[PDB]
Structure 1
Amino acid sequence: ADNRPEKWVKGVCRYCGTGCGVLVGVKDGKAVAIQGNPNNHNAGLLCLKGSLLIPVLNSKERVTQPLVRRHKGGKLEPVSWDEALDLMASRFRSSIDMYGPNSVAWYGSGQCLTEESYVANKIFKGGFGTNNVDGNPRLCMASAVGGYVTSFGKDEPMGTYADIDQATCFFIIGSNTSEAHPVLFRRIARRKQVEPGVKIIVADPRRTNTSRIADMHVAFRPGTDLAFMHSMAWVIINEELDNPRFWQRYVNFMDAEGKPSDFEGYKAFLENYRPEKVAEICRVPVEQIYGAARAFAESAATMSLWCMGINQRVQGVFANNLIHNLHLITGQICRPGATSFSLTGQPNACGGVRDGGALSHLLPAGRAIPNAKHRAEMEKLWGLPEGRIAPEPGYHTVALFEALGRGDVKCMIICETNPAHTLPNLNKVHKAMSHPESFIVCIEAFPDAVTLEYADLVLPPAFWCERDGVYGCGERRYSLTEKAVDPPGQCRPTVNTLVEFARRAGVDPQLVNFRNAEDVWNEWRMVSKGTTYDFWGMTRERLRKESGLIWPCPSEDHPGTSLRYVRGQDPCVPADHPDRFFFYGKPDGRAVIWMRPAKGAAEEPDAEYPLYLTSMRVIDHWHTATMTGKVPELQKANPIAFVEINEEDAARTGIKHGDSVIVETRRDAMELPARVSDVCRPGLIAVPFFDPKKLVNKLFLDATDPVSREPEYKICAARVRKA
């Protein structure tokens, strides 16, 4: 008996792309409890961050009114919503009127609700006529996208979290699952517990909590995991552990010039990547290439999981291709427990930005800007005049902030991201963000986001479960979150803020015909209908009862889809297809192995800057800490930034534990407390990025993958010295 929740409102955790279902306990219109949704994949379980979501919902440290900065370098001061919307709408309309539509941009996030990103994408691409829509997943998942699309012809994993319960080998690469995806790591750990014969290979330059359940920790040299995975393929082929029945029917080979090849040509390519040479290159024992290769191929079902150590890379797309190569040569795929599974970081990078194509070169539900059929498909669906969608991609994120600095982009909206903190090469980016003629509107829940220091107008948004909306997590699961409490003060749901803005900026009101997130969901449901992203069967009523549905889900009686590309399991494979699998993303239904040359970082260490420097997640802090920094118990072990230094390096160089050091790169220098340990393999150092007092992205280079344009945050060259 209670005082203490009167009702429980079903939703989704505000944090990771694990995408735990949550039940928010409310009493008297106020949130008082949280638990995990027993019916979602997480089966009632949350991590400590998710369990401490209620102090964040209830923090009075909020942006609760519209704010304006009258002059560049002035103080933010209160302003009405009607003054703010008019100022905003006039400014944008004006900029388009003088300079054309490409002077205005959207910079959004994988934390926005899918309905928020859908509306924004539509206002800009089909309303203003500019493809300047991008977002922070470009800094994260864009490499997993280029990898999946070139290997399979479609985006997203072909398996699910369920596959975890049935792998007997986990190949966990460039992923600190323990601290980035705690509930998922538990499911993996649980799997090894239930079945002790389960082999776990953790490949990562750093020895993290994740490696503590591994049978093998491959501490390779930063940048050499490509040569590693090629070497694995050499071993699998050399020891006849490959699956010819599979690759003969279901696989094409492209050579190092990206020209059609064959198995025989693959063998010959792989000759350049023998275990003995590669061991020397990777700085690992040769037995590890052999063990990893053998575990992977000989295991009854192998699942690979990776995150930012593979994506945040100039060879990002190719590294994803290389993981798919192993699953493709062995046919460890399209079977329960056997699958190539990219981990998604943000809660809604999948549904909001990837699936809904809210990047500069994309259009919703698998569509592409440079493809004329696609643009016309969208013009039909959006009731647009012919040729209204521009034929060329807008600015990707790095290019977008460069375009800002040059004054080519004059107006910008930032929504649920903190770019003045999380973009790479911050001294350059800060300069760009303070162009004396830029007009930067920030929609931002938290007064302490460093980005608000550059903003000309701030709009007060409804936070998390103060409004309703869908998040699509890493496993293709679309879960709704219902409104639990009212927003405080003058906070407003961004769907509505976006619609009122468009109307006032002269956008055709037929284009933003939306009263709520439910109206936008139905248009998007239609916009997906008959594409391989089809999620037409996920009605709002269905998503209120269900704890998520997994796409494809083409009708109301359809349960959703576990194994994509599988005959009889994926509704996109015709029931009378001749083969049991169909990688319909490719013209001939065959998936592609890519003989990608293994190179390295864009900035490799040398005599002057002898260390690899990296950057990483910590368990207690979500990104920029504007939310977790409000939970007293989440700093009890990580209040401040530090640098991890290898103990052999430290002993050699004279650096002792807790010593203050200067980390220095070509771009900046920064003093930090040193943690000395075996975490970093020799030659490597590491920094977290949660500390707004220690903006480590000032240190990192800006360099991007040429296909995905994802920055290489995971590697640059640094030197370390006593302060």
Structure 2
Amino acid sequence: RPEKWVKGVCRYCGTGCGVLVGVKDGKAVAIQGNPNNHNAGLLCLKGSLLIPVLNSKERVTQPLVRRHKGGKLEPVSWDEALDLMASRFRSSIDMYGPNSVAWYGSGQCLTEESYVANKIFKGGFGTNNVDGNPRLCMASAVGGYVTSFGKDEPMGTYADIDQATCFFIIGSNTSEAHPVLFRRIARRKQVEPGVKIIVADPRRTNTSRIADMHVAFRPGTDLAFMHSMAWVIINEELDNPRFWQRYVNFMDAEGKPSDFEGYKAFLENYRPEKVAEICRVPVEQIYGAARAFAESAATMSLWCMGINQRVQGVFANNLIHNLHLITGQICRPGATSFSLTGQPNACGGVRDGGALSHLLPAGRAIPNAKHRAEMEKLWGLPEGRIAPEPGYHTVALFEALGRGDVKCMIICETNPAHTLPNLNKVHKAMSHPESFIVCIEAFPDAVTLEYADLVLPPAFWCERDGVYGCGERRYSLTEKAVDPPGQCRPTVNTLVEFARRAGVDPQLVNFRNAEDVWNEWRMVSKGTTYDFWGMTRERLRKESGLIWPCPSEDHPGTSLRYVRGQDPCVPADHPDRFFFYGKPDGRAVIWMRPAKGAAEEPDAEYPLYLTSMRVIDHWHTATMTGKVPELQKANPIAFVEINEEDAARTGIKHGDSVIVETRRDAMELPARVSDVCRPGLIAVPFFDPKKLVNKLFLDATDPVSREPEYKICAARVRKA
């Protein structure tokens, strides 16, 4: 049994379960749920089996160098490693200017690592080449929220699940991707059997088995589906005029102001009978979906990659918001429009802290001259040091690296050789013989390390302290539970030593530890609509998370954003009960987004939709969950899901080896034949480093958020 229990957060999903880590003689021996965090002491199996990961010996414990392109990683000292790193970076800026260097990070870094990296790069080096994996994930949700509400992140919280009466769950396999969360939704329907659940997803997954209605639409036709719901809502007088006349503005197909009648006329392009043919669904599912959504006392939408990993991701996020805006199912307990975040710290670390190429900390933006002044002042910089132009977004970043525009790059806590789309093209880029790539990486089996020129050994997870901000705006702290192995070091300290050594002004990285950097970041937030000044380390050790806005030490935090008398940002004497203060007139915005499709659509030559998905037993590239023997008893290897009736008609039997082929590559997989995939669709997981499916996917990006469309491309299938 454990001697003591150290409070933290699950290293996995954006559910952000609180965790308590039992240790004895400086060794983690047991894990349980934080009874006081939102998850109430529960953890899925992945969480429950984190100790063998934490305890694994197959770990990167010394710095390593690759002397030459295509050589072996050999041991180097931290001292030699650091000097190398700083000299290359500095020399590169010296020769070619700061846009020759870049940071590529992740919503798995602690908020403090991403904050310090973001600062070193944007303020130290003078480049906005800071990006990271949430570009590939949540950037559509950010676009959707900013264009609809004028501020990022949901206005609701997980606690809204306990109070919803209808759940519209689209582009989300909640059961496999947010298991504790899916249980809270399951529990809700079980408490109140009257609750309706609508699961919209081209696949039929476990998630749908608690659903009253499963809408298995044709990939890429969900926009049309959601306009059509709106048509049914307005047509049957189920909308909420008192809400929308006061709190909403309308924008037409061209983004010019419009009105309710324009909305009405625009929708006439999206009648149920027409849209049912397009979506390939019975028409009664549209009426069904729209009525459930609108007649329910409280409606909550939840969505994830099926909506965001899409050239039309921003628009699809807008369409989900339109449903809530036209009904006023929002700013109310149980009624809210709630984007699910995948990673544990995409929200806290990358979106809120602004660690993307076009962003600045705490809701500020690169193009915005006043915002840069705000930051030069806060970071004590000279005037005009923050570059006025966005850096490379992710796909354009690795394209930059391929042309040699970006010469030096740090990849931190991500596996881009495994997880970027269009891998053959990326791999060529990562092989630029004149590039210098530094991987900060814990597990030696990450495929990306095959490209590293230098590899640094980080402290993993609760081998050091730091903050995670999950999908519901909870900031939760993880304390230090064990010493890291070998020569592993907290990345926070690594970054500082890196910046001092590369000539960055040391006023800029004046941090001994994560506590220091958290205190400055509290300051940078103060008086913005993200203010978490009230979240001192003292409170975060005592509490199992606080939810922002949280502007002072006696503030409990905020459940409902935009609501008078619940969100400190809304003036007590604001004339009305709601205030979408992210728009200049306090009104949220319904957008008339034309419904299109995928960037690569099926045709005679490639007749099938290919999609890619999450599996419950493996987390992403499986460098962690793959260390846990019991997590292989279901899914050891990649497979392709094929539809029963597509299989019948083309002679494919279950278990059979087939080639899946797209324009970009071809690859053999055992076929798992069923009704999971609707007809015309095939699906693949991406956990297998021996089957790198991103070789198959195209690269095409939403033009506004620059998210890739991993969810749809055109494939064909053939018996091997």
In which range does the TM-score fall when normalised by the shorter chain? Answer: over 0.9
* Equivalence for 1:81: 78
Q: CA deviation at 1:661?
A: 0.3
Q: 2 CA distance for matches of 1:633 and 1:406?
A: 43
- Structure 1 residue 544, shift from structure 2 partner: 0.1
Q: Which of 5, 16, 31 pairs up with 1:8?
A: 5
Measured against aligned partners, the alpha-carbon deviations of 1:280-331 in whole angstroms (never above 9, x if no partner) come to: 0000000000000000000000000000000000000000000000000000
SS of corresponding position for 1:645 = strand
Paired residue for 1:429? 426
Q: Per-residue deviation at 1:5?
A: 0.3
Report % sequence identity. Answer: 100
Query: Which 4+ runs in 1 deviate beyond 3 A?
Result: none
Pick from 462, 466, 470 the counterpart of residue 463 of structure 2. Answer: 466
Paired residue total: 720
Query: Residue 497 of structure 2 corresponds to which residue in structure 1?
Result: 500
Q: Deviations over 1:685-708 (max 9, x none)?
A: 000000000000000000000000
CA positional deviation for 1:53: 0.2
- 1:201-253 deviation per Cα after TM superposition (whole angstroms, max 9, x unaligned): 00000000000000000000000000000000000000000000000000000
- Cα offset, 1:719, TM superposition: 0.1
Question: Aligned equivalents of 2:33 and 2:437: distance in 1?
Answer: 38
User: 1:166-193 deviations in whole A, cap 9, x for unaligned?
Assistant: 0000000000000000000000000000
Distance 1:265 1:57 in 2: 57
CA deviations on 1:413-437 (whole Å, 9 max, x unpaired) are: 0000000000000000000000000
State the 1:377 CA deviation.
0.1
How many angstroms does 1:86 deviate by? 0.1
C-alpha displacement at 1:107, in angstroms?
A: 0.1
CA distance in 2, matches of 1:334, 1:566: 6
Q: How big is the shift at 1:591?
A: 0.2
- Alpha-carbon displacement from aligned partner over 1:36-84 (angstroms, at most 9, x marks no partner): 0000000000000000000000000000000000000000000000000
Give the superposition deviation at 1:657. Answer: 0.2
Q: How far does the alpha carbon of each residue in 1:310-357 deviate from its partner, in whole angstroms, 9 at most, with x for none? A: 000000000000000000000000000000000000000000000000
Q: CA deviation at 1:365?
A: 0.2
- Where does residue 419 of structure 1 map in the other structure? 416
Instruction: Note the C-alpha offset of 1:473.
Output: 0.1
Which of 600, 622, 628 pairs up with 1:603? 600
C-alpha distance in 1 between matches for 2:602 and 2:492:
46
CA distance in 2, matches of 1:174, 1:372: 37
Task: Give, in whole Å, the separation in 2 of the partners of 1:160 and 1:720.
Answer: 43
1:158 offset after TM fit, Å?
0.2
Determine helix, strand or coil for the equivalent of 2:553: coil
Over residues 409-466 of structure 1, what are the superposed CA-to-partner deviations in whole Å (9 max), with x where a residue is unaligned?
0000000000000000000000000000000000000000000000000000000000
Match of 2:381 among 367, 381, 384: 384
Aligned partner of residue 592 in structure 1, secondary structure: strand
Counterpart Cα distance in 2 of 1:162 and 1:683 = 38
1:278-297 equivalences under 5 Å are 278-297=275-294
Aligned counterparts of 1:476 and 1:224: Cα–Cα separation in 2? 31
DSSP-derived class of the 2:29 partner: strand
Deviation of 1:471 after TM superposition, in Å, equals 0.2
RMSD: 0.2
2:717 and 2:344 map into 1 onto residues whose CA distance is 35
Hey, what's the Cα distance between the residues in 2 that align with 1:606 and 1:578? 56
State the partner residue of 1:616.
613
Q: Distance in 1 between matches of 2:717 and 2:292?
A: 38
Offset, 1:399: 0.1
Deviation at 1:156, TM superposition (A): 0.2
1:354-403 superposed Cα distances (whole Å, 9 cap, x missing partner)? 00000000000000000000000000000000000000000000000000
Map Cα deviations across residues 119-143 of structure 1 (whole Å, 9 max, x no partner): 0000000000000000000000000
CA deviation map 1:485-535 (0-9, x unaligned) = 000000000000000000000000000000000000000000000000000
- Secondary structure of the 2:714 match is strand
Alpha-carbon offset, residue 567 of structure 1: 0.2
Q: CA deviation at 1:21?
A: 0.3
Cα deviation, residue 105, structure 1 = 0.2
Residues of 2 paired with 1:286 and 1:523: CA distance? 55
SS at match of 1:717: strand
- CA deviations on 1:87-133 (whole Å, 9 max, x unpaired) are 00000000000000000000000000000000000000000000000
Which structure 1 segments of 5+ residues have no match? none
- Structure-2 residue corresponding to 1:525: 522
Matches of 1:258 and 1:310, distance apart in 2 = 21
What is the DSSP-based 3-state SS (H/G/I as helix, E as strand, rest coil) of the residue aligned with 2:716?
Answer: strand
Look up the match of 2:23. 26
Return the alpha-carbon distance in structure 2 between the equivalents of residues 143 and 605 of structure 1.
24
The match for 2:478 is 481
- In 1, distance between residues paired with 2:452 and 2:542? 40
> C-alpha displacement at 1:269, in angstroms?
0.1
Which runs of structure 2 are paired with 1:343-354 in the superposition (5 Å)?
A: 343-354=340-351
Q: Which residue of 1 aligns with 2:640?
A: 643
Q: How far off its partner does 1:588 sit? A: 0.1
Shift of 1:478: 0.0
* Counterpart for residue 103 of structure 1: 100
For the residues of structure 2 that align with 1:491 and 1:401, how far apart are their CA atoms?
Answer: 28
In 2: Cα distance, 1:46 partner to 1:222 partner = 32
How big is the shift at 1:622?
Answer: 0.2
CA distance in 1, matches of 2:717, 2:190: 41
TM-superposed CA distance for 1:617, in Å, is 0.2
Give, in whole Å, the separation in 2 of the partners of 1:323 and 1:20: 26
1:345 aligned counterpart, secondary structure: coil
Equivalents in 1 of 2:290, 2:279: separation in Å? 15
String of CA shifts for 1:243-265, please: whole Å, max 9, x gaps: 00000000000000000000000
Q: CA deviation at 1:267?
A: 0.2
C-alpha distance after superposition, 1:561-620 (max 9, x if no partner): 000000000000000000000000000000000000000000000000000000000000
Q: Structure 2: how far apart are the matches of 1:259 and 1:573? A: 28
TM-score (norm 2): 1.00
For residues 137 and 637 of structure 1, the distance between their equivalents in structure 2, rounded to whole angstroms, comes to 28
Counterpart of 1:566?
A: 563
TM-score, L = length of structure 1: 1.00
Q: Structure 1: how far apart are the matches of 2:391 and 2:79?
A: 30
Shift of 1:552: 0.2
What is the CA–CA distance in structure 1 between the aligned matches of 2:85 and 2:69, rounded to whole Å? 16
- Following the alignment from structure 2 to structure 1, what is the Cα–Cα distance between the partners of residues 269 and 57? 60
For 2:6 and 2:573, locate their aligned partners in 1 and report how far apart those are by CA, in whole Å. 43
Separation in 2 of the partners of 1:236 and 1:476? Answer: 31
**CA shift for structure 1 position 555:** 0.1
SS at match of 1:436: coil
Task: Report the secondary structure of 2:645's partner residue.
Answer: helix
Query: Which whole-Å CA distance do the structure 2 matches of 1:285 and 1:413 have between them?
Result: 50
What are the ranges of 5 or more consecutive residues in structure 2 without an aligned counterpart? none
